[PDB]
Ligand binder design. Structure first.
Ligand code: CL
Ligand code: CL
Length: 162
């Protein structure tokens, strides 16, 4: 199991514009297009992103290309962030994937806001961090996905995805 297989399980694959769990315009493998309410604002963002007139539809290949960018952007953003980098460096390979997963979903700023949970991960207090992380809107909004990520951090194994 690797980061890609993990996110693909969590986000799914859709070749046509759709609305995410929060009502936003998305495509492919969890690629947010716009928080605006317009479908047209989404269709324009999409074409800017692909470099063609897509009219709201893309190929698998295009979806993958976007996914490669997003994962890379997520890893670079963690490494660049003063709050996140130290956490990432203190972690083992499995737990590292769990932090990337959060960052891809919620953005660097959002994750950087879980101060307390971040401090406990850095301290290796697995049970207590799992417990604090569950106390969030994130967990209340997408419970099955958050539980998967949380188990990843508690255990250090790929059990939830298996
Ligand atoms: Cl809460
Ligand atoms: Cl969920």
């Amino acid at each position: 199991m690797n980061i890609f297989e993990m996110l693909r399980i969590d986000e799914g694959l859709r070749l046509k514009i759709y609305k995410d769990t929060e009502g936003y315009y998305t495509i492919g493998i969890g690629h947010l297009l716009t928080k605006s309410p317009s479908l047209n604002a989404a269709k324009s963002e999409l074409d800017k992103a692909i470099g063609r007139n897509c009219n709201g539809v893309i190929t698998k290949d295009e979806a993958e290309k976007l996914f490669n960018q997003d994962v890379d952007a997520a890893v670079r953003g963690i490494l660049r962030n003063a709050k996140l980098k130290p956490v990432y460096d203190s972690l083992d390979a499995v737990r590292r994937c769990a932090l990337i997963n959060m960052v891809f979903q919620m953005g660097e700023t959002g994750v950087a806001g879980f101060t307390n949970s971040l401090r406990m991960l850095q301290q290796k207090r697995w049970d207590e961090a799992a417990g604090n992380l569950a106390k969030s809107r994130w967990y209340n909004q997408t419970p099955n996905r958050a539980k998967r990520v949380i188990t990843t951090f508690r255990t250090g194994t790929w059990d939830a995805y298996k």
